[PDB]
Structure 1
Amino acid sequence: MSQERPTFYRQELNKTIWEVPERYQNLSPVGSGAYGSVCAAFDTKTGHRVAVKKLSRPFQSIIHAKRTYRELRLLKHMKHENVIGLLDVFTPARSLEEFNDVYLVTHLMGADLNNIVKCQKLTDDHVQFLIYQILRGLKYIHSADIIHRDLKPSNLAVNEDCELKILDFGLAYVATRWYRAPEIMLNWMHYNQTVDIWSVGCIMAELLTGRTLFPGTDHIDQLKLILRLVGTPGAELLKKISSESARNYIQSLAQMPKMNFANVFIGANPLAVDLLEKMLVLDSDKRITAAQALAHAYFAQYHDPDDEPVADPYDQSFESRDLLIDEWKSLTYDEVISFVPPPLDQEEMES
């Protein structure tokens, strides 16, 4: 009746040592270096393929150690159909004193939203469903006061059933900047969760037109492209920007009117145009939230409030702590050894 603890095995792949539980077999590197050190593997406990990631220099510095801890805490929290989740986390270490390596196991994700677009032309139904699922995932993460901040097509995984998950592949072409709200890009003020809604608007526009909405080359070019669509800030919004230099810069610019989006996105479903208007509002105090957006008539064939859950509370009191490297490392170790795995999925077989 004691819980089994795994036996590990060791191998080399691409000049990298991999030491993993024997349940993970046929490790094979994936993404030719793009995603970091990641292998596909067959999980013998589930009969499915998974991704195994060996973290890079997880405790290099206080910053890296806190980053490691943060990512593990977040991954462990996420329990939602449209957000990446954690299948397993392990280390070959048998104590904190020999703890150096952290491995994360996730589902093997679908191609990203760029790949989807490159390979097929999307129907309005699939645009509705893909944007719906992003918003569904955002309702969940936002309810726990978690903001993504990095939404872009490469951080959205889509499978052959058109099911979507939100993730963040992190550090090291599509610039995250192109999808970023001005107030967060430019540090105008303390921002809200609707920075992510701006990104959804930018993604939706691109799915409708086939073109990047605001492909700015730097912060000033990005701002100018944005204001050309949505118009220069009004008096109400200008008062909420803290920096006098920022305000003075903004006022130096040529006045621009808000464009009529029905002219810009001509051909698109009028409901999609109306929702884009509500997502790309410049003043983030007036921008639609994820939960509100789910109720928009554009999503009438997918929306179901009783199937759009919120998240359990997430304790982010660690974010305010200044700790030493070994303290962040020990906290990470605690999270590894406290991990409780999810149950297997339903295994109904249609053929």
Structure 2
Amino acid sequence: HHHSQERPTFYRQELIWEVPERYQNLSPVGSGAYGSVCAAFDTKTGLRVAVKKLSRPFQSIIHAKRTYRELRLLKHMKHENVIGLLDVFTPARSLEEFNDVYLVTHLMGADLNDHVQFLIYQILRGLKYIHSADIIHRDLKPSNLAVNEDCELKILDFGLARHTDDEMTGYVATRWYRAPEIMLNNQTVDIWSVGCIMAELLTGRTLFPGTDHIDQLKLILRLVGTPGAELLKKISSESRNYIQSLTQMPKMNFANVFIGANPLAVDLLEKMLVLDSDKRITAAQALAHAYFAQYHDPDDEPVADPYDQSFESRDLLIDEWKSLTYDEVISFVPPPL
């Protein structure tokens, strides 16, 4: 139980959104099987916002756990370079009516598809924090990075679509950013994604635009070379055979792929796009790279509070996922304005 369940504030428009009256000028910006997002203006704060209506949130156990997972995640994220919950709400007046979940954050200028140094810095700073609470993103791409007027950035995950091999969001494949260990076979799988993003920011074009999985690898290997002895041993799936059988190609001079770029940037990209994930540079290491010397401050790059995700192992009924989420909705307190 919550104030709003006594305050007749909810109105209804089809776009079928029931939201408090503080939230006006709703405007669709994206949709999928898992929910919808509108921009809107909040008359209470005076600022512009986004709102996600989860779709049929307690209809299946997938949706139900997923709903709870996202809300728990966003309620924990308190970092400038990570999406933060401004509000969570439901038209429900009690648990018996609790059927829809709505989350509210800042609307940041647009998204992404010395400004590159600043953006990348911000991405890694947010990634250090995500990774420190033992969350891997898994789907970093330009459309999951929101930016404002001042090139001030926030990592997010729209999460509207079912994750599939051939997934698409606008005119971009998800596989273009996939760490090749996933595609084929640690937390640095996000770092692979970061490096492909930084390449795109420097050149204006996609680093690895594969048609399909074999094309993608050939394009990756074209850039960074075929694997050495050590990486091959660590690949546990015998069919290892396939990449070992590939004619050895030499890594390119990254300097002449990224013509004119800061030498430091090119050096950082090399340390990001290493095939062997035990040797790829981590978010915390990469912030201390000299490329960011004008932004780096280790003490203003915090890690997260311990994140209790013991729920991930639990086999719960839908209604327990629902009732666990209800508590989280009803106890949500907005961040200090």
The TM-score normalised by the length of structure 1 is 0.87
Question: RMSD between aligned alpha carbons?
Answer: 2.4
Offset, 1:5? 5.5
Distance 1:106 1:228, change over 3 A: same
- Give the CA deviation at 1:9: 2.7
Deviates more, 1:54-63 or 1:143-152: 54-63
- 2:118 alignment partner, one of 129, 135, 139: 129
Q: Which structure 1 residue ranges, 5 or more long, are not aligned? A: 116-125, 345-351
Q: 1:227 to 1:6 in 2, by over 3 A?
A: farther
Instruction: Say whether the 8 Å CA contact 1:30–1:40 is kept in structure 2.
Output: yes
Report the equivalent of 1:98: 97
**Measured at CA, do residues 302 and 291 of structure 1 come closer, stay the same or move farther in structure 2, by a change above 3 Å?**
same
C-alpha displacement of 1:4: 8.1
Contact persistence 1:209–1:265 (CA under 8 A)? yes
Unaligned 5+ runs, structure 2: 162-170
Identify if the C-alpha distance between structure 1 residues 6 and 88 changes in structure 2 by more than 3 Å, giving closer, same or farther: farther
Q: Is the 8 A contact 1:55 1:102 kept in 2?
A: yes
1:166 equivalent in structure 2: 155
Tell me the secondary structure at the aligned position of residue 85 of structure 1: coil
How far residue 277 of structure 1 moved from its aligned partner, in angstroms, is 0.8
Correspondence list, 1:1-351, <5 A: 7-13=9-15, 17-31=16-30, 36-114=35-113, 126-172=115-161, 173-187=171-185, 192-245=186-239, 247-344=240-337
Question: Is the alpha carbon distance of 1:71 and 1:35 closer, same or farther for their aligned partners in structure 2, counting shifts above 3 Å?
Answer: closer
**Is 2:5–2:92's contact at 8 Å kept on the other side of the alignment?**
no
Q: Distance in 1 between matches of 2:328 and 2:34?
A: 23
Q: CA deviation at 1:148?
A: 0.8
For the 8 Å contact 2:49–2:105, the answer to whether it is kept is: yes
Q: Name the SS for the 2:113 alignment partner.
A: helix
Query: Residue 83 of structure 1 aligns to a residue in which SS?
Result: coil
SS at match of 2:330: helix
Judge conservation of contact 2:200–2:206 (CA < 8 Å) in 1. yes
C-alpha distance after superposition, 1:183-234 (max 9, x if no partner)? 12223xxxx1111111111111111111111111222221121111111111
Structure 1 residues 253 and 76: alpha-carbon distance in aligned structure 2, compared to 1, 3 A threshold? same
Judge conservation of contact 1:35–1:169 (CA < 8 Å) in 2.
no
Q: 1:224 to 1:140 in 2, by over 3 A?
A: same
Per-residue deviation, 1:32? 8.3
Change (3 A) 1:208 1:35: farther
Distance change >3 Å, CA 249–CA 231, structure 1 → 2: same
Q: Which deviations, in whole Å up to 9, do the C-alpha atoms of 1:84-115 show, x marking residues without a partner?
A: 11011111112222211111111112211119
Deviations 1:28-78 (A, max 9, x none): 434588995333332232111212221112123111111111111111111
Q: Residue 12 of structure 2 contacts residue 19 of structure 2 at CA under 8 Å; is this kept in 1?
A: yes
Contact 2:49 2:106 in 1 (8 A): yes
**Structure 1 pair 34/48, CA: closer, same or farther in 2 (3 Å)?**
farther
Q: 1:59 to 1:295 in 2, by over 3 A?
A: same
Query: Separation in 2 of the partners of 1:231 and 1:305?
Result: 33
Greater alpha carbon shift after TM alignment, 25-34 vs 236-245: 25-34
Conservation of the 8 A alpha-carbon contact between 1:110 and 1:158 = yes
Partners of 2:257 and 2:37 in 1: how far apart? Answer: 41
Give a deviation string over 1:134-184, Cα, whole Å, max 9, x none.
011101111111111101111111111111111111234211211111112
Deviation of 1:257 after TM superposition, in Å, equals: 2.1
| Map of 1:348 onto structure 2 | none
Q: Distance in 2 between matches of 1:145 and 1:31?
A: 28
Is 46-55 or 273-282 further displaced after alignment? Answer: 46-55
1:218 & 1:204 partners in 2: Cα distance?
22
Supply the distance in 1 between the matched residues of 2:69 and 2:31 (Cα, whole angstroms): 26
Cα 1:318–1:30, aligned 2, differ >3 Å: closer, same or farther? Answer: same
When the two structures are superposed, what TM-score results if normalisation uses the length of structure 2? 0.90
**Identity of aligned pairs, percent?**
99
